[PDB]
């Protein structure tokens, strides 16, 4: 992918998450579990829906071929009609195939951006309160319960609340 | 103690202009630029100082053949373009046909 | 001690539908959608209930 | 049927068809393509 999230630093997808395109997997003292994110999912579904409605609706003016008949002494116009009809069909076939090929590339990269943006959204929230594992996971330098996990998912994580607890853990690890 | 700060931001004007994208519609942007004209004055005007030949109720055939109802166009000046009604009332006062009439009108587009 | 973790990931399933891009061919995606029709019944039916004139 | 072609009718449920250019009725737009698939999900992990 262009943004390096899908099949990138997140090596594989999650078969366990079936209710959303993007989401989180947490692991704390109270257990683990998959959970989908609402913000990226809502934006993506509407974004992809609008892309489909743009490719599929901006073709109502496509060339509709009309059957015309010519006699044996009108071969020039009949050949003119044949080449005129084939040309328009070729133009729209090229237009249809190329639009799909390009928008397919953009759609895959659009999903790649959403994953990377969601990861950076979590990253800039925790800051140095957790450790960047480099595999798509953040290892908290403090206890993070189920309420703490959900606060990260909806852009409300309070950095100063756990900053002092994380500072003690960081100094313990650095000292050896 | 809270130290010095620097921030990165972007422009935010007071324009209600909107555009469209593939994945999103009606997106308000700081600067846009229309490239489509949608207004006309509803008149027929001279083409760079040259008055058009407006046939009014007469047709091209009646003008050329000299229909007595077309005395306005006995000696027309130089024109830029010809304006003809879809079905002028004064076309052939005596009924008949004008042979290769469409071919003559094609030639008249270059005169 | 291994601390608590939160991970960011994307959907995956058992779909076999494939798409093509400009730079890459035969890419498997979770969700795809055909937009082309390739079947016909081989008959000459009525057009919206009106029977055609078959000479 | 709602769309008829010289080779047969088509269920007019998709934007495009590749059966025959000469169509009458509520017909999809004709293309010479053999396949037209829009990716809507993300890159599936094997």
């Amino acid at each position, epitope marked *: 992918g262009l943004f390096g999230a899908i099949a990138g630093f997140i090596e594989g997808g999650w078969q366990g998450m079936v209710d959303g395109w993007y989401g989180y997997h947490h692991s704390n003292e109270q257990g683990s579990g998959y959970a989908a994110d609402k913000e990226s999912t809502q934006k993506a579904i509407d974004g992809v829906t609008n892309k489909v409605n743009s490719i599929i609706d901006k073709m109502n003016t496509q060339f509709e071929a009309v059957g015309r008949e010519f006699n044996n002494l009108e071969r020039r116009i009949e050949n003119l009609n044949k080449k005129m009809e084939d040309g328009f069909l070729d133009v729209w076939t090229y237009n249809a195939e190329l639009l799909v090929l390009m928008e397919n590339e953009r759609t895959l990269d659009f999903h790649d951006s959403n994953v990377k943006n969601l990861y950076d959204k979590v990253r800039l929230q925790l800051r140095d309160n957790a450790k960047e594992l480099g595999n798509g996971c953040f290892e908290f330098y403090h206890k993070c319960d189920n309420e703490c996990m959900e606060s990260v998912r*909806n852009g409300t994580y309070d950095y100063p609340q756990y900053s002092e607890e994380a500072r003690l853990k960081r100094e313990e690890i650095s000292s050896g | 103690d809270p130290g010095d700060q620097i921030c990165i931001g972007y422009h935010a004007n007071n324009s209600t202009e909107q555009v469209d994208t593939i994945m999103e519609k009606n997106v308000t942007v700081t600067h846009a630029q229309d490239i489509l004209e949608k207004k006309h004055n509803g008149k027929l005007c001279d083409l760079d100082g040259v008055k058009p030949l407006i046939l009014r109720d007469c047709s091209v055939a009646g003008w050329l053949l000299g229909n007595p109802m077309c005395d306005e166009f006995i000696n027309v000046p130089e024109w830029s373009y010809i304006v003809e009604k879809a079905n002028p009332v004064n076309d052939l006062c005596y009924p008949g046909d004008f042979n290769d009439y469409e071919e003559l009108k094609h030639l008249l587009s270059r005169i | 001690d291994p601390g608590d973790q939160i991970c960011i990931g994307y959907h995956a399933n058992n779909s076999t539908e494939q798409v093509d891009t400009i730079m890459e061919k035969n890419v498997t995606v979770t969700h795809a959608q055909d937009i082309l029709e390739k079947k016909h019944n081989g008959k000459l039916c009525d057009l919206d209930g009106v029977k055609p004139l078959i000479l | 049927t709602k769309c008829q072609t010289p080779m047969g009718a088509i269920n007019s449920s998709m934007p495009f068809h590749n059966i025959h250019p000469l169509t009458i009725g509520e017909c999809p737009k004709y293309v010479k393509s053999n396949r037209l698939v829009l990716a809507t999900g993300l890159r599936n992990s094997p």
Partner: antibody
Amino acid sequence: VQLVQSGTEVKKPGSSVKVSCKASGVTFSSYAMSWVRQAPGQGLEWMGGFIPILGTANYAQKFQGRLTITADGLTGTVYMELSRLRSEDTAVYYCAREVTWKGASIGVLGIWGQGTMVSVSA
Amino acid sequence: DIQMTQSPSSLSASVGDRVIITCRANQSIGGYLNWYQQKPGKAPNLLIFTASTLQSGVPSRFSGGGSGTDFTLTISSLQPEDFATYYCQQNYNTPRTFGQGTKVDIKR
């Protein structure tokens, strides 16, 4: 665009009702639809939805197993099928397009139909 | 599920008054709320989506705001066209939930 539904149905108990939701014009659309019922003089009730780009239909708990929301491909037409009808199913059934002036909007019902009234008695 | 409760259930006002309708929830829905207006014998018409943004054609007198669990729909100058039932709908959870319904009534 406008959304048009079927006519008023007078069904017998235990039968099935299929209500269509077509759009006006030959245009093809992949907008997500939603079916909402409203009992006579009561409030609105979400029955289910259908997201064409996902190919899935979402249903409600009180309708699961009795409701079938399908679509005629990409023609902008969606269908609902309520089975095992009872007198308590008597209501006005609406179909709404999930769209705003911003384009597709998966949650908000911008364009509505006219409603199809369903009556159930022996 | 996410139960949505409206307050008040049926208010009374006259032309020119400021009408405030509050819609609650039993779970935080993060700004994913919509407002609808139903006139007698007519399909519901959308007024506000995403709890703040007005749908096209809605007069500026209609206003909305809120975040989390408490929401508000406000009509600055009530005109003899806003007398109807108002519903609040969530677009956060898959089992979509509607409000009970608040009916603004003519005062006399």
